[PDB]
Design an enzyme around this catalytic site. Structure first.
Site, PDB file in Angstrom:
ATOM      1  N   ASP A  46       0.798  -1.207   0.000  1.00 12.36           N
ATOM      2  CA  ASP A  46       0.000   0.000   0.000  1.00 12.36           C
ATOM      3  C   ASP A  46       0.827   1.252   0.000  1.00 12.36           C
ATOM      4  O   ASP A  46       1.601   1.467   0.870  1.00 12.36           O
ATOM      5  CB  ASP A  46      -0.936   0.048   1.221  1.00 12.36           C
ATOM      6  N   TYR A  51       2.306   9.844  -0.132  1.00 16.86           N
ATOM      7  CA  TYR A  51       3.366   9.326   0.736  1.00 16.86           C
ATOM      8  C   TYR A  51       4.771   9.700   0.274  1.00 16.86           C
ATOM      9  O   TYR A  51       5.729   9.431   1.020  1.00 16.86           O
ATOM     10  CB  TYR A  51       3.268   7.797   0.845  1.00 16.86           C
ATOM     11  N   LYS A  80      -2.946   5.750  -4.729  1.00 15.48           N
ATOM     12  CA  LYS A  80      -4.108   6.503  -4.322  1.00 15.48           C
ATOM     13  C   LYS A  80      -4.075   7.819  -5.071  1.00 15.48           C
ATOM     14  O   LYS A  80      -3.021   8.443  -5.203  1.00 15.48           O
ATOM     15  CB  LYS A  80      -4.129   6.706  -2.802  1.00 15.48           C
ATOM     16  N   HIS A 113      -8.262   8.654  -2.671  1.00 18.42           N
ATOM     17  CA  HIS A 113      -7.617   8.635  -1.358  1.00 18.42           C
ATOM     18  C   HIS A 113      -8.567   9.112  -0.269  1.00 18.42           C
ATOM     19  O   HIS A 113      -8.667   8.485   0.790  1.00 18.42           O
ATOM     20  CB  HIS A 113      -6.344   9.485  -1.360  1.00 18.42           C
TER      21      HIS A 113
HETATM   22  N1  LIG Z   1      -6.249   5.572   3.384  1.00 14.53           N
HETATM   23  C1  LIG Z   1      -5.741   6.388   4.311  1.00 14.53           C
HETATM   24  O1  LIG Z   1      -6.140   7.528   4.460  1.00 14.53           O
HETATM   25  C2  LIG Z   1      -4.615   5.910   5.189  1.00 14.53           C
HETATM   26  C3  LIG Z   1      -4.305   6.595   6.357  1.00 14.53           C
HETATM   27  C4  LIG Z   1      -3.254   6.121   7.139  1.00 14.53           C
HETATM   28  C5  LIG Z   1      -2.535   4.998   6.720  1.00 14.53           C
HETATM   29  N2  LIG Z   1      -2.832   4.364   5.570  1.00 14.53           N
HETATM   30  C6  LIG Z   1      -2.075   3.182   5.133  1.00 14.53           C
HETATM   31  O2  LIG Z   1      -2.100   2.243   6.209  1.00 14.53           O
HETATM   32  C7  LIG Z   1      -0.762   1.845   6.505  1.00 14.53           C
HETATM   33  C8  LIG Z   1      -0.578   1.374   7.943  1.00 14.53           C
HETATM   34  O3  LIG Z   1      -1.211   2.231   8.883  1.00 14.53           O
HETATM   35  P1  LIG Z   1      -0.339   3.217   9.797  1.00 14.53           P
HETATM   36  O4  LIG Z   1       0.752   3.955   9.082  1.00 14.53           O
HETATM   37  O5  LIG Z   1      -1.339   4.028  10.588  1.00 14.53           O
HETATM   38  O6  LIG Z   1       0.466   2.237  10.785  1.00 14.53           O
HETATM   39  P2  LIG Z   1      -0.042   0.922  11.524  1.00 14.53           P
HETATM   40  O7  LIG Z   1      -0.152  -0.281  10.603  1.00 14.53           O
HETATM   41  O8  LIG Z   1      -1.150   1.252  12.516  1.00 14.53           O
HETATM   42  O9  LIG Z   1       1.307   0.700  12.379  1.00 14.53           O
HETATM   43  C9  LIG Z   1       1.611   1.646  13.411  1.00 14.53           C
HETATM   44  C10 LIG Z   1       2.968   1.396  14.065  1.00 14.53           C
HETATM   45  O10 LIG Z   1       2.995   0.105  14.683  1.00 14.53           O
HETATM   46  C11 LIG Z   1       4.360  -0.352  14.732  1.00 14.53           C
HETATM   47  N3  LIG Z   1       4.403  -1.814  14.523  1.00 14.53           N
HETATM   48  C12 LIG Z   1       4.367  -2.458  13.331  1.00 14.53           C
HETATM   49  N4  LIG Z   1       4.420  -3.806  13.496  1.00 14.53           N
HETATM   50  C13 LIG Z   1       4.535  -4.033  14.824  1.00 14.53           C
HETATM   51  C14 LIG Z   1       4.644  -5.221  15.700  1.00 14.53           C
HETATM   52  N5  LIG Z   1       4.660  -6.463  15.173  1.00 14.53           N
HETATM   53  N6  LIG Z   1       4.728  -5.020  17.041  1.00 14.53           N
HETATM   54  C15 LIG Z   1       4.719  -3.781  17.579  1.00 14.53           C
HETATM   55  N7  LIG Z   1       4.625  -2.658  16.847  1.00 14.53           N
HETATM   56  C16 LIG Z   1       4.530  -2.716  15.495  1.00 14.53           C
HETATM   57  C17 LIG Z   1       5.086   0.315  13.590  1.00 14.53           C
HETATM   58  O11 LIG Z   1       6.307   0.884  14.037  1.00 14.53           O
HETATM   59  P3  LIG Z   1       7.693   0.350  13.406  1.00 14.53           P
HETATM   60  O12 LIG Z   1       7.774   0.934  12.021  1.00 14.53           O
HETATM   61  O13 LIG Z   1       8.728   0.905  14.355  1.00 14.53           O
HETATM   62  O14 LIG Z   1       7.523  -1.149  13.459  1.00 14.53           O
HETATM   63  C18 LIG Z   1       4.134   1.386  13.081  1.00 14.53           C
HETATM   64  O15 LIG Z   1       4.782   2.644  12.978  1.00 14.53           O
HETATM   65  C19 LIG Z   1       0.066   3.062   6.151  1.00 14.53           C
HETATM   66  O16 LIG Z   1       1.475   2.770   6.094  1.00 14.53           O
HETATM   67  C20 LIG Z   1      -0.602   3.476   4.846  1.00 14.53           C
HETATM   68  O17 LIG Z   1      -0.143   2.596   3.795  1.00 14.53           O
HETATM   69  C21 LIG Z   1      -3.865   4.797   4.813  1.00 14.53           C
HETATM   70  C1  LIG Z   2      -9.684  16.588   0.597  1.00 12.75           C
HETATM   71  C2  LIG Z   2      -8.312  16.192   1.111  1.00 12.75           C
HETATM   72  C3  LIG Z   2      -8.206  16.017   2.598  1.00 12.75           C
HETATM   73  C4  LIG Z   2      -8.767  16.932   3.473  1.00 12.75           C
HETATM   74  C5  LIG Z   2      -8.618  16.724   4.835  1.00 12.75           C
HETATM   75  C6  LIG Z   2      -7.920  15.615   5.307  1.00 12.75           C
HETATM   76  C7  LIG Z   2      -7.351  14.712   4.419  1.00 12.75           C
HETATM   77  N1  LIG Z   2      -6.672  13.624   4.863  1.00 12.75           N
HETATM   78  C8  LIG Z   2      -5.346  13.618   4.994  1.00 12.75           C
HETATM   79  O1  LIG Z   2      -4.714  14.653   5.172  1.00 12.75           O
HETATM   80  C9  LIG Z   2      -4.603  12.310   4.903  1.00 12.75           C
HETATM   81  C10 LIG Z   2      -3.467  12.076   5.672  1.00 12.75           C
HETATM   82  C11 LIG Z   2      -2.782  10.868   5.573  1.00 12.75           C
HETATM   83  C12 LIG Z   2      -1.650  10.664   6.357  1.00 12.75           C
HETATM   84  C13 LIG Z   2      -0.941   9.473   6.283  1.00 12.75           C
HETATM   85  C14 LIG Z   2      -1.372   8.470   5.430  1.00 12.75           C
HETATM   86  C15 LIG Z   2      -2.494   8.672   4.634  1.00 12.75           C
HETATM   87  O2  LIG Z   2      -2.886   7.678   3.783  1.00 12.75           O
HETATM   88  C16 LIG Z   2      -3.208   9.870   4.703  1.00 12.75           C
HETATM   89  O3  LIG Z   2      -4.335  10.058   3.921  1.00 12.75           O
HETATM   90  C17 LIG Z   2      -5.050  11.236   3.984  1.00 12.75           C
HETATM   91  N2  LIG Z   2      -6.150  11.436   3.212  1.00 12.75           N
HETATM   92  C18 LIG Z   2      -7.493  14.923   3.063  1.00 12.75           C
END
Ligand SMILES: NC(=O)c1ccc[n+]([C@@H]2O[C@H](COP(=O)([O-])OP(=O)(O)OC[C@H]3O[C@@H](n4cnc5c(N)ncnc54)[C@H](OP(=O)(O)O)[C@@H]3O)[C@@H](O)[C@H]2O)c1
Ligand SMILES: CCc1cccc(NC(=O)c2cc3cccc(O)c3oc2=N)c1
Length: 316
Positions: A46, A51, A80, A113
């Protein structure tokens, strides 16, 4: 190993590697850990334009294909469309740019996104003179049409959305001349915010729910209130972890897997990267499921209230 079948007939591996890292982390790290994730066993990757790592992540993927570890078909790569690109004429170029950056011919998954559209420009978060972000008014059904056009071009195998609520989902689903349903909706999901109703909706509509921050957010100062509960310190996850001789993170991920959720796990640490794929090695009991279900606090980690004004703000 496991995949779920998508309503367009493609398959999505149910465990995905999250690649986001804050601007502080050097870009080279995205390359290294992504290769590690592939070596460990992840096949779902992802990423996003936001990013600022698609060059490095794509390079890792190409490296593992070229050293013979996997084939392009083994990898499920997600990008995204960022919200400064919601005007339809901007959708396909953004995808093309992502592809040019990642050096792949297609993504397996392209997501809108966020629903909340921003002012189109070369800047990623456009701010006016007082530092407030400038919104745009865009009918997301037109964005969806441009997405469908990307699917027909072969630029994206499957298309879906992210951070959409029930209303925005059905606004896409009711669309006249709808060619393709969203295969998926990628939203925040973990034991403190399980999305049981949103998930049940999706199951009804054949839309996969994809969990992010499923380990509890990386807890950035800029976005997350540090007084919020730390999910991996939760007493019940720590209890279950010691019971199964696993870790709280493994409990969280397995929790999503057993309730039919595709789950993302971000880790830039090699040992945790390799640990996270053990989620396929054990099961939780129906009573373990019940006890984790009981942790639901409808808790967002991503604090977004400077965007409450937005007409498409997801959870009004
Ligand atoms: N669609 C969206 O708007 C959106 C928003 C946020 C995120 N995302 C996607 O979701 C992905 C993951 O979510 P996230 O970035 O919020 O992080 P997450 O998966 O909730 O992980 C959070 C933290 O947990 C730690 N961790 C990982 N594996 C572990 C384990 N086995 N034991 C203990 N701790 C552990 C990691 O630190 P370490 O790196 O130190 O292991 C990481 O920084 C992102 O990287 C991104 O691709 C999408
Ligand atoms: C209309 C645009 C708009 C307006 C308000 C809020 C947002 N959201 C974010 O700032 C995000 C932060 C982010 C951060 C980490 C990883 C993600 O995957 C993230 O995704 C996001 N969408 C987008």
């Amino acid at each position: 190993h496991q995949c779920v079948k998508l309503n367009d007939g493609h398959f999505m591996p149910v465990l995905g590697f999250g690649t986001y890292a804050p601007p502080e982390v050097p870009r080279s790290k995205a390359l290294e850990v992504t290769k590690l994730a592939i070596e460990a066993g992840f096949r779902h990757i992802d990423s996003a334009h936001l990013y600022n790592n698609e060059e490095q992540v794509g390079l890792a993927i190409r490296s593992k294909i070229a050293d013979g570890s996997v084939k392009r078909e083994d990898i499920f790569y997600t990008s995204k469309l960022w919200s400064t690109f919601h005007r339809p004429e901007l959708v396909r170029p953004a995808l093309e740019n992502s592809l040019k950056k990642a050096q792949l011919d297609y993504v397996d998954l392209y997501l809108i996104h966020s629903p909340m559209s921003l002012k189109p420009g070369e800047e990623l978060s456009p701010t006016d003179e007082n530092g407030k972000v400038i919104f745009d008014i865009v009918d997301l059904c037109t964005t969806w049409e441009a997405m469908e056009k990307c699917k027909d071009a072969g630029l994206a195998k499957s298309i879906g959305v992210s951070n959409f609520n029930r209303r925005q989902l059905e606004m896409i689903l009711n669309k006249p001349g709808l060619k393709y349903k969203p295969v998926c909706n990628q939203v925040e999901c973990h034991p403190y915010f399980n999305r049981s109703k949103l998930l049940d909706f999706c199951k009804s509509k054949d839309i996969v729910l994809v969990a992010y921050s499923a380990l509890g957010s990386q807890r950035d100062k800029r976005w997350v209130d540090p007084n919020s509960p730390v999910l991996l310190e939760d007493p019940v996850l720590c209890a279950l972890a010691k019971k199964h001789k696993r870790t709280p993170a493994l409990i969280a991920l397995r929790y999503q897997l057993q309730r039919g959720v595709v789950v993302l796990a971000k880790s830039y640490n090699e040992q945790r990267i390799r640990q996270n794929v053990q989620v396929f090695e054990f099961q939780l009991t129906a009573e373990d499921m019940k006890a984790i279900d009981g942790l639901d606090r409808n808790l967002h980690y991503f604090n977004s209230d400077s965007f409450a004004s937005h007409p498409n703000y997801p959870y009004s």
